[PDB]
């Protein structure tokens, strides 16, 4: 028996009329290409650019009746990746590519095998930098949905149809972890059939649900913003004689809170709307600033201190600074309920 590389030159040579520019079942039913991916690496999910980098094995399966053999004994024949220019292949591309490349280290990372009835398996390795728009309205508590979609470029719907296979259309590697996110296991699979003025082109897509890890933002930003509000509360047990101190405590804390609020969006997209980390920093900016205006209502209410009213204005100040030892640690805890319950129902 002749070896398979001299046998595939009989199937696909100038004899037997095989032509790699012509799809299987020409002037007939469309080619049913069935696809599944295997994610090796995932991550570097940037939000200034609103993209993410994935590293997949793209497997494609179709049927080519011109490649059906009956004389060679074994059930499968592998091509050299040097000879991939000699079969028909689907012109799959990604509708949100934003740059991608193959991998060509020590050999083209391409796989091709042909069964007896003409089933062709074609597996390649691609690195993609896919685009996904980020919905950052509830920013440390959001569930991002970033997609990837696989279209035909030249063949319309009456010539080539993509499908996901029903035997696990998206596999993920064994210990694939993410530093900021967790990848939920349920991955939605649906159609995205495009209509241009050239024609209608097939499309299938896969949704990936990315839920954040709140444990980072809870340490860097939610706790040090909770402490500086408590620095405003220690201004109330100091008497109304250390006016360089309680104003110096009402200023050094209200201006380091502006640093926390400006530093809370140092590596984010410049979005128009207000997000959930913003209505935490701006409300904690209000408590650190209303404790300064509390002292201006103490230093002025005792400045106006004819023998009873000048004693009445000393004890009026000693009552307005005993409500703020309760009202500010009780309004701030009502906000701690109406914030975390609000961003746990959604």
């Amino acid at each position: 028996p002749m070896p398979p590389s001299e046998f595939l030159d009989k199937l696909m040579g100038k004899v037997s009329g095989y032509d790699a520019r012509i799809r299987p079942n020409f002037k007939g039913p469309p080619v049913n290409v069935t696809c599944n991916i295997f994610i090796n690496s995932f991550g570097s999910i940037a939000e200034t650019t609103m993209d993410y980098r994935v590293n997949i094995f793209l497997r494609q399966q179709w049927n080519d009746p011109r490649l059906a053999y009956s004389e060679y004994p074994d059930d499968s024949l592998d091509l050299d990746p040097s000879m991939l220019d000699s079969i028909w292949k689907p012109d799959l591309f990604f509708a949100n590519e934003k740059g991608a490349n193959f991998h060509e280290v020590t050999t083209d990372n391409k796989l091709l095998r042909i069964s007896k009835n003409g089933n062709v398996l074609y597996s390649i390795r691609i690195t993609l930098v896919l685009a996904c728009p980020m919905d950052l309205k509830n920013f440390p508590m959001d569930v991002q949905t970033c997609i990837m979609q696989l279209e035909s470029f030249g063949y319309t719907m009456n010539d080539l149809i993509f499908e996901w296979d029903e035997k696990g259309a998206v596999q993920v590697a064994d210990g694939l972890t993410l530093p900021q996110f967790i990848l939920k296991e349920e991955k939605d699979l649906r159609y995205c059939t495009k209509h241009y003025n050239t024609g209608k082109f097939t499309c299938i897509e896969a949704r990936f649900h990315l839920e954040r890890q709140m444990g980072y933002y809870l340490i860097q930003m939610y706790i040090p913003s909770l402490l500086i509000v408590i620095l405003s509360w220690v201004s109330f047990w100091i008497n109304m004689d250390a006016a360089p101190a309680r104003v110096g405590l009402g200023i050094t804390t209200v201006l380091t809170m502006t640093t926390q609020s400006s530093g809370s969006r140092a590596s984010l997209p410049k979005v128009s709307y207000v997000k959930a980390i913003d209505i935490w920093m701006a409300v904690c900016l209000l408590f650190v600033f209303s404790a300064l205006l509390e002292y201006a209502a103490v230093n002025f209410i005792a400045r106006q201190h004819v023998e009873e009213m000048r004693k009445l204005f000393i004890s009026r100040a000693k009552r307005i600074d005993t409500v703020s030892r309760v009202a500010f640690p009780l309004v701030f805890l009502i906000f701690n309920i109406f914030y975390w319950i609000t961003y746990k129902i959604i």
Copy 2:
């Protein structure tokens, strides 16, 4: 009937005299190439570099009378993208490229189809990083106009003319959003015919109007600069005895305002002119600095306090600090009218 790949080798082979180096209608009327684009992705509009990255489908249509057939039955014939070196194609380029590339993932993302009368549709996928000069004179309220222009490189006006088609010359995708901008729907289309010393070359261009989203800059910079001015106003209800406090309030606020003014242009081009965020920060730098010079006109006007004039200088200070409890919250509101009305009329 022979298949179309063996039929296009009869139209474009060494027989029938077709030559891909010679334009249609040679030594005759010029080739009328009609163009339209389809924007898949838009954005990453940087202003240090003054560029933006677009991802388009570039469709070109012309007429090639040497490709008119009459024997094959179907109305259109697709080329393999492997055989694109064998037709004539227009040498379109972008006059403000600044780097660009094709997309070659799983197949060259190129489309080509030939009708019966010789109409050729040619659609490719390009990622561009186009250059546009930014007019940042009114910076959070500006309407940027960034263009893209499509020229011929080798053929002059008497050989090749570009046109926009009248059936929607610029299509935009379904949910194409931008993080900082909104893309207005009216897109201007006009001619940009170039004259060099080599000849005159055809050119068509498309204007994209990009209006910003003020909602980001309104949160990070316009509101925290509005608060620090109000920190200067709480210095007036404190009596003229806490001189370490009111000077400490006239210094910690006037030096965190320099941080806000220096941090207002941290990721901008170093433009010569003064912009609208600069005449907000510099005027709010004046109110936070004139409240310090108000106190120097209080601490010195009471320092000069022979029994009536030493009582006259105590109540003169208690009058200059009661005008500044009104005049500074009234001059700052006249500026709030003369700023936002000024940048809403233009």
Copy 3:
């Protein structure tokens, strides 16, 4: 005798039936490819991306019985790297590539030599940017294990098996040093045989143990955080009359400690868990903040100063500020034992 380049065209030409698409020992036992690497450069170990860049010489050895000669006199024959498309080579790739390239400066950096019995040595130069997940739970005291794994792509286990050679399977260069890490000499070598739905593919891997250098983090972060805690201890020898000073010392130190705690993770991945530099900064944030609440328990306990109890409240404050001259330099040293012993046992 004819020269070896005209002798290798007799071994691998169209005569003698050699075919570079067919592995040695076809329809027989699998090819035993034995591998070893030589690390030229190592480092740029980033942790935002969780990757590292290595620069290796990849040596592969197998046996090809079709390349066994007996007539040429010398024992080895070198190929030109121009003629590397004419032998069989294993399709080795790296399962955590994340981008890689060859080196082609003045010549393809490729080596190939063929012995008399058919032993083929094949050595190439590769730059890899390999992926490794970082376990940063004990961050300046961790031992990172970053791997590299060498798989087949097209040939399954019944056709091609990778092995490490027993004569030093990983060599490292002479003076290969790292700025942040030390590379331990014991390098683990084990199998990583993959199972896909395509088949089972061979895999071998090498573990590199990277232990950090604590001497950098001990200078920038552990010592300046140890000083600011001692700034809180100098607040206790100042009497309870400099209330703008001891509050100004209880605020300027507790807000520069927030800068140290926010600046301790300026170039790190946003990990969910709490790490060993975080429970040093957050506990030293507690000592610099509990020295402020100590003074509020002094300024209020003397504010309540009918002739004995108003003398009893002056000396009660002079006792609570003599326990904090001992208890705070003794609780902080118990934490210095329970921190460094905790991160030296593991």
Copy 4:
């Protein structure tokens, strides 16, 4: 008549002895190649790297007597850019390339036309990142001269000579603007003939004079450094009783001036010499620091206050603080004359 692509295969085919490896006028006078450029884009002038990115049309004109025809009727013949490997072209390169590339979007952006007497026009599009050393001794007021030089690589002076054409050797586009610089219209053109140990090679160069825009640095750095000096002058009208204030004004301003001086070189090369922004920041650092030492000469000269000398030391302090209300706003204005006149004469 045969078409020009079948006519240029008669001029440059295997017949008629044309050889693209042999220059025109071989073993004769040297080839006179005349050059001019057209700048499309200019800018991104970095100074850490000391480079700038230009985007040019490089036009070259020479005479090739082997390409002179007399039978074809028209006066010019265009080549396909596919056929540019078949003529002789000069091996022009840039002696300060630092990386460059062509542009190959929808067609090689190359132009070639041949007149009847053999005049060959050759125009290509190049993006360059050219190197220029920056003379930053007077940094916001400098006139940078950045060059570009065009050499031969293989042909010496007795075989190939470059010239600039006299009809406008450097054209600039219509609205080519720069964010930081202005490009002066007079562009110097001179020879730069190189002598190596291989031979002497031709070279022509073009100087571009880049004058900065002082209006950016005048807003971010020269005005906020002028204000903090005036903050030191408001310390003099405050009496010598607010010692926490005037020292707090002599410290918060002298340490925010160190931030201005360290932040004045945040994105600059680390040059050895002292530049004009440095002797503004260091002298304004002296005025903000000598107003602190003025107060130490007041707080100590009144501390020494036997009945006349203890009254003589109260009014001696009230005289040293009335010279500094004049001498510091008069020495600082003499420096404002001796700085701007010094950097306007040069």
Copy 5:
């Protein structure tokens, strides 16, 4: 006479038995390739990556007796760079490449000429990004030695030997300057012959001595750290009554010194050892911190002030603050001698 391009096809064609895969003097003495470089550009010496970018002309000279001619009249023959695939060339590479590329703008920047006796000159243009480990123990005063080494890849020592030529083996361009360094003129040239398990391979290297420019670090870091120590010395002439001031001067200066010490290594590798800028910042951190503990030994030594000992404790404080007006400006000047003499002897 036939032209040289038709004469080099007689020397190197299929006739006369020339084969570009076989080195000169085969089965004889080794090929003596002699090398020299010409540095066009140098710099961008990063230390986070510990690399530097050079731009060289690499000249190689060897003898090929198969290229000796005697019939053509002229003494040298130039090859087209299109025909460089047809001679033998040495497989030189750089053992610390870390990425490199050729230059291919308007022509391959390659030069080749063949003399009558067979001497071959081969000059190419390479951009390298070479690796050098940085010894930063004395950081602003160090002399860095960064190397480049030129090895053979496929040919061992018994087939190919590299040498430096004795006529100026490293030339540097005319005005090649560096922003941070100066390149010393004496360049060491020595052998670096490698031994692998494949064989022994030739290697030559060139050392470049890079001495820094201290004038940058003397302005940004050594002088502003010298001023803040002098801010601690102005705390001593202020009396022991401005306790919010002298503590406010002992805190605002000791916490801006932590900013100077943390900002002194903002763009450096994270090295384990302590460097010369670190033992300047940490010792100046000690003087700014020991002036705070001096005041705690004044405010407590006067707090203990039965009629003589309560007068003895007032004048004891007025003596401990008169030693620190001398001892701190004398210990700091002994350190100024023992630092600069220590880093000038080495």
